[PDB]
Design a protein around this ligand. Structure first.
Ligand SMILES: *[C@@H](O)[C@H](C[C@@H]1CCNC1=O)NC(=O)[C@H](CC(C)C)NC(=O)OC[C@H]1C[C@@H]1C1CCCCC1
Ligand SMILES: *[C@@H](O)[C@H](C[C@@H]1CCNC1=O)NC(=O)[C@H](CC(C)C)NC(=O)OC[C@H]1C[C@@H]1C1CCCCC1
Lengths: 303, 303
């Protein structure tokens, strides 16, 4: 039986019309054009021989307006102002984007999913969805020239930009910046080795996934036994699980299936020690890349 | 270590501008507007009390041009002609779509991936990628009102439309029509129980995935032993695997890694009997939802 769950990304058309190319003569990467502003990673100012320990303050002051070349590839935007906000540049251009969607800037939290538009030379090439890992990495698909690719969610017709790609880690995962300029987690936009925090199972997403199995007729794991939220979180600390915090989306799943959150917290404790040769939605390991909102939307048709 | 592999869909913007709403007063579903033509599933003509055994020939002749209401939701298109091609309708409208992309119609084969734009009331709501299963189903995410949602691939700037969604099967998977009007496999667009063919591992995609592991430093399974293509296909018949057929995309992976196709065919035979407690790219079961082209593009940056 198929769960009806897929990695679902938002339609990318609105964000495609906001992508541009930004180059300083050394690096070429992507920028996000909204109204008269173009956002892009600041290491575009960084020469090839300075990516490991740049002085961005000295690099910024060394730049002028025409130091930045901004190009629409699917035109030329004259830069009339430039500023630095943390790990991002805020370029002011003479023409405003006539296709600027309604948007906000928002930081995304661990366990929440968002859609990414991978671009190269300002040309969108593919879209996918990821969940922010507890260690503030994402398991994306990025190559050289992908920096400036953006991640976002959508509430109604409003696009909530939450991620601009910056780099890849030694273990293959990726991280980037929020549009307030900060990097997620404790990462720095410097091409050097960096400490990486441990990853953890997103307990709330594991609960959403077990609810998806029940909604598809799969419930062998559901036992009448219960684990309280308090006792589970204490258990979670000693087993590399995130601490569980219920939401209205999870409560809706509990009402629909008739299975209380606490029953599944007990199941997670038992399934973590082993599946005992059985499968859940065609899997032998716990899944945490689907959110409660993904289950409500894709299976129950509720947004 | 992260493989760098994600379910990667094409950017949906070009196809978003082609979606419309089509209704006959009973069902509401989606249509694809290209030039002066709107394609949609033919069961839009079907009353609610006739979805299990309709007479589409009698239903079509019972319709006139103004029987069909076509609406753009992101306008009204006056229908000036209507025709039936297999399981699809071919509506002719007075205005041509000014955003018609360069396109072709192409049938997709088992094991090949394509991107789907899920729409409701002509409004695009999400995009995802699937592989055509050997039994001509897809493991998608579709609810009521999703029919008319389209699947496609992209060669350059040319969009190759390959799928229009029609129905869901009893086991939860989905199937639909090619744009020549035929349903994939032996399925019929009738809301009745239907025989379902067995699913199989896509051997060529399993080989692509093992190559992705090698490209990420994971090769414990690679033994010097080899299985020939001929002997593997004979084995495949008795084990619910597709018969392997190499391509240039697979040969490129063999050259890059230095591991011959035949070594991995032997590995598949051994891994199928059990992983022996080890993991490949964080998995304990064979993966076949990534194509050789996915590995070449996402990891090697080759299209
Ligand atoms: C965009 O410019 C680019 C996107 C990267 C390249 C490959 N995959 C991606 O996602 N970003 C970078 O090249 C950054 C630039 C720095 C200044 C932020 N650098 C980077 O991503 O490093 C690649 C990691 C392999 C490197 C580190 C591993 C451990 C030893 C130190 C280097
Ligand atoms: C689009 O109109 C819609 C999309 C479906 C609905 C739910 N998920 C989907 O992908 N398509 C349908 O409703 C078709 C219409 C027929 C005329 C082609 N019917 C359908 O999808 O049936 C749903 C399967 C549960 C039904 C069968 C299971 C086994 C017993 C017979 C019915």
């Amino acid at each position: 039986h198929h769960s009806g769950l897929v990695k679902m990304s938002h339609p990318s058309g609105d964000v495609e019309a906001c992508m541009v190319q930004v180059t300083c003569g050394s690096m070429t990467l992507n920028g996000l054009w909204l109204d008269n502003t173009v956002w892009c990673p600041r290491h575009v100012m960084c020469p090839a021989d300075q990516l490991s320990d740049p002085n961005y303050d000295a690099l910024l002051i060394s730049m002028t307006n025409h130091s930045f070349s901004v190009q629409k590839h699917i035109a030329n935007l004259r830069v009339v102002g430039h500023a630095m906000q943390g790990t991002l540049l805020k370029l002011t251009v003479d023409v405003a984007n006539p296709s600027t969607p309604a948007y906000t800037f928002t930081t995304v939290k661990p366990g929440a999913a968002f859609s990414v538009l991978a671009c190269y030379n300002g040309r969108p090439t593919g879209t996918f969805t990821v969940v922010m890992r507890p260690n503030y990495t994402i398991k994306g698909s990025f190559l050289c020239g992908s920096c400036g690719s953006v991640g976002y969610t959508k509430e109604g017709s409003v696009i909530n930009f939450c991620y601009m790609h910056q780099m890849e880690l030694a273990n293959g995962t990726h991280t980037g910046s929020a549009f307030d300029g900060t990097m997620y987690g404790a990462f720095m936009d410097k091409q050097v080795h960096q400490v990486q925090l441990t990853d953890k199972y997103c307990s709330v997403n594991v609960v959403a996934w077990l609810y998806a199995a029940i909604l598809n007729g799969c419930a062998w794991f559901v036992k009448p036994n219960r684990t309280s939220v308090v006792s589970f979180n204490e258990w979670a600390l000693a087993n590399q699980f995130t601490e569980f915090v219920g939401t209205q989306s999870v409560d809706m799943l509990a009402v629909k299936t008739g299975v209380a959150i606490e029953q599944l917290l007990y199941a997670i404790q038992q399934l973590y020690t082993g599946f005992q040769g059985k499968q859940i939605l065609g899997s032998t390991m716990l899944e945490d890349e689907f959110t409660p909102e993904d289950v409500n939307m894709q299976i129950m048709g509720v947004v």
